[PDB]
Amino acid sequence: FGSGNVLPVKIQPPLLRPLAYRVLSRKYGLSIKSDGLSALAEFVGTNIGANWRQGPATIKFLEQFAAVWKQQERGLFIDQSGVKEVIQEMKERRDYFKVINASQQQRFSYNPHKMQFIFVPNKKQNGLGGIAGFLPDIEDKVQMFLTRYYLTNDRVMRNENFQMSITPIKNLLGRDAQNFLLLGLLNKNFKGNWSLEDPSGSVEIDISQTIPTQGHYYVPGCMVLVEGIYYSVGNKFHVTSMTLPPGERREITLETIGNLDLLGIHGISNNNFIARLDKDLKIRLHLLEKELTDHKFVILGANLFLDDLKIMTALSKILQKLNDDPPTLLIWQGSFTSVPVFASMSSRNISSSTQFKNNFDALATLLSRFDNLTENTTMIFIPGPNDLWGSMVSLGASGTLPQDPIPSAFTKKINKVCKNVVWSSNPTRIAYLSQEIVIFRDDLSGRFKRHRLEFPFQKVQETRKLVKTILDQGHLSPFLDSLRPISWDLDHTLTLCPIPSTMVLCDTTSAQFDLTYNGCKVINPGSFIHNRRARYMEYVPSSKKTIQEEI
Amino acid sequence: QKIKNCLIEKSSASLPNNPKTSNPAGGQLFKITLPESVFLEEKENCTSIFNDENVLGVFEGTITPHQRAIMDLGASVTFRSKAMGALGKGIQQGFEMKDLSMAENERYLSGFSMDIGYLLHFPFLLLLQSPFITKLLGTIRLLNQMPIVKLSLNEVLLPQLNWQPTLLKKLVNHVLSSGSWISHLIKLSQYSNIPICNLRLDSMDYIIDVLYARKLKKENIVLWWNEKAPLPDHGGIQNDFDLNTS
Known part of the structure; x- marks a missing residue:
């Protein structure tokens, strides 16, 4: 806040505290601590020349310091951060986008008696968890399906037709x-x-x-x-x-739940209070459409094999064009190995875990060539059925739905060759401004076809059927615990009570489609290579898409 | 349908017994044989018998032509053509083997007389001794066209100090063991009936697999054979979580 004076004379706070006290403690605010008072001496001494008998300057400085504490929640006591807020003040004179994993997502329970969502404190923050803190408790197994029933029954009982x-x-x-x-x-x-x-x-x-x-x-x-x-x-x-049960649009669903920041990017919520915000939504919808069509993020075809050579050559040819116009985000999805990696008792050959490591080292060589794509593109890594930890038990089969990211041990220097890389769970949530997108990777059509009730009594119709079931059931796992085990405390990750604006639902057993339903958009990338053709699709936050092919 | 020039026939092969699949229902298993080119062609269209409603499973889609021939014919294959003298016609084009085939006795495969070479890495029937077979094969495309017996000793290690003597010692035994390698390979091959170059020395489960598979094919039992996959091929039911299997 200004410079160019004679020099920063040093004075003791004893001759400075009365003005600060009268401005802050008496009228609005309080708790000027001794250390905080000493901290507030340096900046007022920066322009100390010919002051303490001057006019507005000191009062305006104290007014500006109060502005941060009305804006930010902060607290009562003023500590050594007092300079940290003046750094923000001088700062005042894309962003706000995140990728939320399954583990880091906030947990919310539902009370049927109160028709309202109650916060659940996260065990990681307060619990020690030094040895075992991720492990659930048995009481969640008893309420896992009760929670689903309560959410669906509330929606059914609030429908218009039923009364x-x-x-x-x-x-x-x-x-x-x-x-x-x-x-x-x-x-x-x-x-x-x-x-x-x-x-x-x-x-x-x-x-x-x-x-x-x-x-x-x-x-x-x-x-x-x-x-x-x-x-x-x-x-x-x-x-x-x-x-x-009928489906419900998210605009009518939000009003019932108020304006809860479930995927809260506005702020965070604790056991004390919750957060809501309405006025910023209009202006950020304005910004979404404020000639920002340059933003361009691309989902590749699922199930791309690194060990195969033709796939690597096709990926190099695709990145050749991607270098010209760098995508805003680039999502590499699907299983990164063509064979499950397990304990591999035979040591005559090279170990499968070492082979997994080596196959992630060729990516560095193929990626280091294209410097611009490194410089201004963020990459999102989605796991698959045959990745490291799951295949050690399931041996290639599909098991627990919350799947942890790829270990950082076997992939270390891809974080160096590329600038922005994020590893994410199998179900994840991309929060982009006023938009929520869900990333999910599994074969849904095969499991639907295999397990049907079979009542005793053109292919794109199956896509509409799948979309309608997934969206009306409001859950990504319409299956019992027998078919697919589920982590007990992470089930909220798989429940779509507010319908996402944009859905990424990739299935190698289902043909690509582009469907719209009650307030959402469902796209299906799949089968990276098919009929000697390598396909990858583009999608724009302005609700237009493109399909780009490279033999 | 009659649209495909294949051969279908109702069969009674003995299926495997997955714990989940337990309901008997009825029996209408089929034995469809169809060349792989028109099978790739049929992969394209939406409507076809292999992909339609009420399909329980495909049970032997994993086996490659290489495995089918190495299991059916073996090392000692002979020609029983007769009919018209199409030996020249057979050699100029690709000899179709389904119609005419016979497996002669292989009691004495070879009286060996042939030149042998080396190729080794330490990061004509040539012998390939490299940690990375695929990388060396891909880097030199000309290496593919020549016959190679692939024996792989892997994971070379060094003490990091005075490594010249240990490199010399590691090279000496590989130089001098050629007479043993070929002798043991022929000893296994003469009983195995697998061709010499396909067979490897350290590989021992492969012999059991081929013998057990062909003596099963002597019976009507289905192979459930699965290639580079840790789980059996049960028709696709093996891709789902089950409590009994777990």
């Missing part, structure tokens, strides 16, 4: 007739019979004369709306109709 209403199952124990609307998990009992389950209880289900609503998938492990008649001669709910 027959959904009845708890145990309310059917004495009735011999009438109709009921039951909502619950569809599964198989320990006896092998199809059944429906809600927190109240369970009931067996008869499909012998069921007429389902075509247009979506009926896989065990998902919420289903059902209608029929209950017979007390046995215990059977004879079904006459079957559907899935």
